[PDB]
């Protein structure tokens, strides 16, 4: 259930994300791109290991200890700017 919220969460930095991207500089929009890029990528990862009854506790674990620190990182730079 904690993961439900999470994932979500992390769609909203996703979509927050994307939101001041296209409203960025281009510099700031590539370097806030790739933490979106590592952010959505382990919210993909998440998304399909939730689901995923072969994912491991470890496994999903990890996914959320990456996807939260790929949302630290992003919303580091969200606040950053």
């Given at each position: 259930?904690?993961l439900?919220?999470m994932?979500?969460?992390?769609e909203?930095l ?11 500089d ?14 959505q ?7 399909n ?12 674990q ?10 630290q ?5 969200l606040?950053?700017?």
């Amino acid at each position: 259930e904690n993961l439900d919220k999470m994932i979500s969460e992390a769609e909203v930095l996703n979509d927050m994300a994307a939101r001041k991207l296209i409203t960025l500089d281009a510099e700031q929009q590539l370097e806030l791109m790739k933490s979106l890029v590592a952010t959505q990528s382990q919210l993909e990862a998440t998304k399909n290991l939730i689901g995923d009854p072969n994912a491991t506790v470890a496994d999903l674990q990890i996914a959320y200890t990456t996807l939260g620190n790929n949302t630290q990182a992003l919303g580091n730079e969200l606040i950053k700017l």
